[model samples]
Target: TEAPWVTIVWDDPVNLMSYVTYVFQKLFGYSEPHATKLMLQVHNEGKAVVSAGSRESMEVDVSKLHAAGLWATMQQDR
Candidate 1:
């Protein structure tokens, strides 16, 4: 399999769940259900790998998440 890059969104006590859902919805264009599901994943799972792609794309995706005020980071997958 090809190596892939990923962006992980970490959970934080400062952000409200509804706000996270809205941010995911607005920034990534996730549907209400999908956005809510991911937000909850972050809440319960401590973090969620929200996006995966080439290094450059993952970098952009992570940057967007950060710009939206969400704590996010990128890493290359083995």
Candidate 2:
């Protein structure tokens, strides 16, 4: 069986907390509160897994996150 893939977002010096929340909302359609929660997680932790699914899906998500200027990467398990 294949394992799922995950897209992770890493904390960076550039993006503001509010902008990070906004980006979560804009990109993932997360609600304000939900986006804020994830943004805070990213702030408190060094990184957070923002999405998960097939490797192909995470690949696209990471690309999109990068385009949005968020530091993002994807990984898969065997």
Q: Give candidate 2 misplaced runs (Cα > 4 Å).
A: none
Candidate 1 has which clashing residue pairs, if any?
none
What is candidate 1's TM-score against the reference? 0.90
lDDT of each: 0.89, 0.89
Q: Kindly give the stretch of ten consecutive residues in candidate 2 with the minimal lDDT sum.
A: 69-78
Q: lDDT tens digits, residues 1-78, model 1?
A: 668898899998788899999988888888999999999999999999877899999989988888888999999977
Report the lDDT tens digits of candidate 2 across residue range 1-78: 779999889999988998889999998888999989888888899898888899999988888899999999988854
TM-score list, all predictions: 0.90, 0.92
Q: How does model 2 fare in lDDT?
A: 0.89
Superposed Cα deviation of residue 25, candidate 1 (Å): 1.2
Model 1 alpha-carbon drift over 4 Å, by segment: none
